[PDB]
Design a protein around this ligand. Structure first.
Ligand SMILES: Cc1ncc(C[n+]2csc(CCOP(=O)(O)OP(=O)(O)O)c2C)c(N)n1
Ligand SMILES: Cc1ncc(C[n+]2csc(CCOP(=O)(O)OP(=O)(O)O)c2C)c(N)n1
Ligand SMILES: Cc1ncc(C[n+]2csc(CCOP(=O)(O)OP(=O)(O)O)c2C)c(N)n1
Ligand SMILES: [Mg+2]
Ligand SMILES: [Mg+2]
Ligand SMILES: [Mg+2]
Lengths: 541, 540, 537
């Protein structure tokens, strides 16, 4: 006989799952025993939060779900943040959690909890299997749900006794969630005329635009047009070095960017793969003096300040390259040419440098200058994520990963561990702050164990700056943002990672190159100069 | 100056809502006051249940959401079944419910209840607005959610104080929910080859295949091919009288039909707009010796016994007429020609009738007396098995079933709505003795609207579907017998005309007079239910 | 061999469930087959809604859960309103519903639904059992949850295959949910002192005061004191004809009653079994600085205008009799005596159509204290709540927690089952009557000794006269006519009509003498209903 836990592993190996991020427990150790002989490799993590973070990173970089595996109760509830972040940022994840047996469901036993009810608000798919026979079906649809447009987390609760119960059904095959056609040809033609008749057409790329397939088709469009482009944070990597002329910056949390002015002067905006989570439409479209065209894999959500005049629902890559044929050779007006060149001048101006503290822009330029396009960069949340988002340039798809949907602390380091597994042989850079670093720093042990070729930069200010300089704006006074010091170099070494410090701005470029040449995980303490951070919230008008 | 309630009506005005089925209350009477001055016509209903039944009928027939409007607490909770039936059967509805004010939400006060949490398991979209400014956005997205593929119910809870609070925001224009392209051209080409290589290809049409646009593209294809089609109860209407040769019956609750045998012998099945709610794949694909091709607006759910080898997701109409081009002139094998002819004989044979009137002679009498411009609505029960498998409907959405939830009572409210969507047409409703009373209150609404309805009550004195299934499993019924209600008296309490068929010889006359009768009519039909156990027989 | 469904009936037998109001279906017919050979009697209903109303009535009248039994999907969802009403009005109910099998949970198949999630907002207990062995435990606790203080509805979803799966576990024996002690004796003494110092103390009885055990202890206290009392609608029946001197009306939906004044002039209010669902505290404790003492079986919920200075949590009957010993023989202030007498005087001051008061006085004069009277919701429920006096516990049942339409007639069928040999009177309006009128067939089937009065006005007056107050215009309240006599006779019940005010008393007496169900059409005069919401305070 073969039990339900066997049939979980079989399902996972039908999906081609190469790794599983887990922490074992009594209610789930059946599956961990099955994995001992066969199936995906098991990355033992040091907190379930980071196992979900790693699963989301796999989703972001491959487009197929990453997999975490945890036990009942506390193990399951430690996924909560990990899966909201996945779901909100379009990262496919399949979370597998144990549960008490079916007879103990309604009982007060150790670690009993309504797993499925908890994860309903934070997943595309939350379910508990109550028959071992249905495990193959539940998991296949969970994977398909996580991969289907508007990607996200699929949670499946597995009772201890169903995992141990015998079953004779086979695992379901690899059944790929399929792709769509392009938007209707009449709609694509309608959007084309609008763009041609426009005086300042602008492209707004969003979180779904930055997939390899979408980026290839978008670059194809930009090669054939004069079309200006602005990016949401997670759209990074769409334009290339070749097409950098089309790039007018990343529109962010405050409407104070050259990209925001460009969106205002537009009379026609083609949003591609645009999710409002990254940029509230009330920020850039308040007056409603623009035709919006919504190109996306799923219809739009209507805001007061987001009323698509047209929607091109279908495969972004298919619709855009159908639209490229219709827009090929479109040139811009001379008054648009003047406007765009002037904005590039402002864009290059803010990307210039200004104590033994290293200013954030010196970090960005030094690091960009030291890594090729074949290095993935992950980034935590904080003021450092504002600086990176608006000034660090990534020219190949999905080489600069941000948490801009839920903005959760700690993602950087686990994402980097996952990034190195997805992309072996490649260095990976992870950027965090002093506060968020401790949200996930436990996985430095997992990094050292995998010898992850990681270089983590901890920007040290001593405070939770993003929340602070916002508090200063609203109240003239921070509150609850200060914390004591931890020696980042000594911290790295307790884990057997290499720890370095940048005690001068003169010292930054040398420390980076030694760390990049260093084999195995490395953590660099960067005392950072946050004098200018309040300016990130300043207003243009 | 404008309050939140005004901005609800303005939103309804923007979606082109013609009617709103409502029952007022303290917490929602702001909106009922705004409807008094302008906006959709308000059909006062006699139970919130039937307002949601009608809302779903509007969605079934127009493809745009029907709207019900109810108050807090009891008004809201009486929508529950109406919204699960709408969601499970792809009927767009937007249910609007009042709630206690924001300051009273966490308090134990009259009619307080977590509206949004209650409807989460039973809707596409369950939300409570907590700012009057957000009303136009919440309702637009609720409407777009109901009409997004896999259509269903969108519930919006409306706190009293929000409806009364002022606001200056404008209503949001009609932002139509958009349609997809055809499935990728390489996938359509791949499906076409499989069908040409297939010894016996069969189409399985489902609940999404019976839309006007889908049906138009399906008929075009069948005009250009020799393709056999089997339908799920709610796929009714897809095949016209011209293409009736292609039709091999409706596959149902039991695997005992010629259409089931045809699905078995197929080596390639192209499912169009197929939702398994109507027919478990365990029931017709148990051996898994078929190429399944899933054509639909949304990807499939994987069963053990449903693993499509190809999926063509996209606008069904676009994908089908793309595929019609590739398959034009496809011919059957001569061994397929023989097989299908033999099955049509088995199909014609079962569709043959023997003081009670047999279910078949009802169907033949009724079909013979109503044109294709007459909508027919059916309740759930043994009558719904007879109607689903033996009443033929040849124009899209002229035979409405509850085959997703199998909810009792739907028939009569569905007819009241159907007559409002299609004025100047007769509407026939079919129910049994038990299900009629679930919804019989709305006969007052029908008389009020003078709905041109002709409601047939298949009278047996029991809940036969539950019984003959109980007899199959346990050799004994339990809790299926109930006392008799004079259907003719019942109709006349409400001011409707009541007729009874005392003899089979009297059926055709009684039908014709009822159809010529202006205003609602209820017909008591004493039926012969000796043969109903045979609907569940194992014949294969 | 024993299956899970057998073990569902065995559990019910252990709870002493006499009747089960149900509608069978494919997913639950296992239990309907088990119920065919033994155990609880099955009342076939004509809508699950009503099955839940009848179950709630059994809970209201016995204090032990009533039981309804339905199938998956539509059968389950037709309980929603029934169970939130029960839960809001403290009526113990155990709802049992079929569900698709455990392998088809996550499948898009007929009548599949998240039963447990749906009923979480509406019950004190919503669960699906996924192991037949766990059936006796899940039910026992469900029954105990429904009977537990702050009683309400417990929902149990039963997968079809679990019902069919073998099991050898036994059922669990009647597990009586237990009783509490009286509140701490220090707290009772503390409250007692506050009352003796008070110049005008007032009791506010609520929905948990009207249980038999509470009422007996309350009457004992009132016999030994000069305490004035005011009731919530569902507190009806607390005060006997002997102690009517203590009763100062039922505080209602508007703050315009003599009872609302005594509440204002009170310097101390001892609330007993008080649930704010019946009367929002902002209506009476709004303006003043009266000491609130919360006596109840569960702690209070803090309102801005309800901040008790003391709480006596525990068995209400034990607490009030302990407090009766501390307050025996306490007599009123002369300033309180004058006040009370004046407001008894304000109290007793209260066309072919019949005026609502004439109905109330005719009916009250015709029926004993051994006649249950149920009432629907509508303007008639205002007239009955304020002016129909009920002198024995739980003989006047109102839906004053959810205010759901249709409860009256099903409540009466259930009431006749729990109290056989007694006539039952049910009162409804033209609108609410059609919400539940189907069950007239069930009534005829059981020959329930019911007399149903339809106050026939032509509209939904409560909303109408409230709409008039707020907007000066009704909207959506008017509906066509139904012949209530012809309707009754469709079902084989007798139908009667009062064509004259002079004909009312005769037809009631003929209806009361008539055996089996009766529906009386009453054309009612609703001119004065606007005044129910008038200011007089
Ligand atoms: C899990 C989580 N906790 C808290 C926050 C709120 N938050 C956002 S940025 C921030 C400050 C982070 O400080 P640090 O990581 O040191 O970066 P800095 O802003 O100092 O550069 C906080 C507390 C969040 N978004 N997610
Ligand atoms: C709301 C609801 N309640 C109960 C059921 C279960 N059920 C399915 S068929 C049926 C019998 C219907 O009786 P009737 O309308 O007289 O039809 P018949 O089977 O006698 O033709 C019942 C109770 C259901 N499907 N929906
Ligand atoms: C199930 C339900 N539906 C609607 C309401 C709102 N409501 C409360 S009273 C009422 C009027 C009922 O009219 P009727 O029953 O005829 O009594 P009347 O006020 O006319 O005496 C309405 C619509 C409710 N509380 N519960
Ligand atoms: Mg910091
Ligand atoms: Mg019947
Ligand atoms: Mg009325």
């Amino acid at each position: 006989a073969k039990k339900g836990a066997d049939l979980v592993v079989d399902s996972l190996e039908k999906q081609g799952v190469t790794y599983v991020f887990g922490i074992p427990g009594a209610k789930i150790d059946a599956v961990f025993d099955a994995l001992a002989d066969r199936g995906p490799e098991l990355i033992v993590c040091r907190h379930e939060q980071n196992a979900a973070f790693m699963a989301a990173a796999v989703g972001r970089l491959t487009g197929k779900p990453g997999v975490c595996l945890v036990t009942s109760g506390p193990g399951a509830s430690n996924l909560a943040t990990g899966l909201v972040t996945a779901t909100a940022e379009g990262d496919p994840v399949v979370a597998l959690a144990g549960a008490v047996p079916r007879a103990d469901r309604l009982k007060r036993t150790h670690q009993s909890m309504d797993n499925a009810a908890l994860f309903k608000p934070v997943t595309k798919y939350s379910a508990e299997v109550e028959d071992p026979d249905n495990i193959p079906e539940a998991l296949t649809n969970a994977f398909r749900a996580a991969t289907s447009p508007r990607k996200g987390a699929a949670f499946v609760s597995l009772p201890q006794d169903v995992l141990a119960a015998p079953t004779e059904v086979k695992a379901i095959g690899p059944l790929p969630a399929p792709k769509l056609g392009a938007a209707p040809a009449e709609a694509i033609e309608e959007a084309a005329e609008a763009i041609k008749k426009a005086k300042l057409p602008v492209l707004l790329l969003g979180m779904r635009a930055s997939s390899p397939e979408a980026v290839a088709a978008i670059r194809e469009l930009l090669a054939k047009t004069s079309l200006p482009v602005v990016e949401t944070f997670q759209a990074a990597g769409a334009i290339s070095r070749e097409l950098e002329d089309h790039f007018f910056g990343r529109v962010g949390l405050f409407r104070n960017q050259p990209g925001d002015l460009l969106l205002e002067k537009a009379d026609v905006v083609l949003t591609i793969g645009y999710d409002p989570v990254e940029y509230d439409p009330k920020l850039w479209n308040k007056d409603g003096k623009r035709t919006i065209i919504h190109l996306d894999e799923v219809q739009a959500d209507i805001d007061h300040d987001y009323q698509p005049e047209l929607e091109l629902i279908g495969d972004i890559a298919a619709t855009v390259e159908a639209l490229a044929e219709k827009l090929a050779g479109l040139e811009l007006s001379e008054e648009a040419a003047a406007l765009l060149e002037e904005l590039l001048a402002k864009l290059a101006e803010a990307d210039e440098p200004p104590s033994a503290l290293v200013h954030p822009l010196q970090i960005i330029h030094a690091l960009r200058s030291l890594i090729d396009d074949d290095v993935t960069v992950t980034c935590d949340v904080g003021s450092h994520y504002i600086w990176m988002a608006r000034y660090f340039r990534s020219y190949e798809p999905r080489r600069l990963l941000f948490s801009n949907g839920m903005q959760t602390l700690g993602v950087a380091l686990p994402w980097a561990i996952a990034a190195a597994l997805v992309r072996p042989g490649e260095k990976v850079v992870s950027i965090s702050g002093d506060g968020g670093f401790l949200f996930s720093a436990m996985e430095l042990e997992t990094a050292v164990r995998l010898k992850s070729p990681i270089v983590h930069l901890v920007w040290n200010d001593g405070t939770y700056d993003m929340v602070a300089f916002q508090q200063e704006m609203k109240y003239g006074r921070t509150s609850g943002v200060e914390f004591g010091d931890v020696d980042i170099v000594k911290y790295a070494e307790s884990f057997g990672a290499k720890g370095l410090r940048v005690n001068s701005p003169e010292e930054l470029a040398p420390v980076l190159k030694k760390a990049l040449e260093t084999e195995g995980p490395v953590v660099i303490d960067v005392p950072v100069d946050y004098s200018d951070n309040i300016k990130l919230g300043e207003k243009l008008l």
